[PDB]
Amino acid sequence: SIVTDNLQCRERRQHPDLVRDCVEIELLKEAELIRNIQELLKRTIKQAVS
Amino acid sequence: ANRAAQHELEKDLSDKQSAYRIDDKCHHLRNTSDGVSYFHGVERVDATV
Amino acid sequence: DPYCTRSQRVSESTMLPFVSNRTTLFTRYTPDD
């Protein structure tokens, strides 16, 4: 939730600075890492209940 | 400037035509159709912008 | 030179913005690719 709010607030930038820079790259990487980890957790908990 | 703004509208029209083709071929697909097969794992992926 | 700038020249020219409303960044490709 914190990461996606960061994405909308940083993406509403004024026109001479709306860039694709080092901040956007690591923000997108962080969002994908979060989704990957909370995909792995479901598999782990199902193996636990089995 | 008039022609450039035209070209922007034409590009939007092209994207919407491609979307119409894909989603119409989705919607009119039926059970007991010919082009159906298993594809495991596309419900796991969600890459949308 | 007054004729060294026209609308047909700065319409071509690239340092000026002339921006649109799309924010997606399309990619280009090379023929061997």
């Binding site: 709306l18 860039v19 | - | 690239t14 924010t23 997606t24 280009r28």
Partner: peptide
Amino acid sequence: PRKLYDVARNTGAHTSSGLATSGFRTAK
């Protein structure tokens, strides 16, 4: 060939700028 060199800076398979050879340009 100024725009040819300008496009050829970004001509590889990566995220290129708004550099459309005629017309408008991406905002980002």
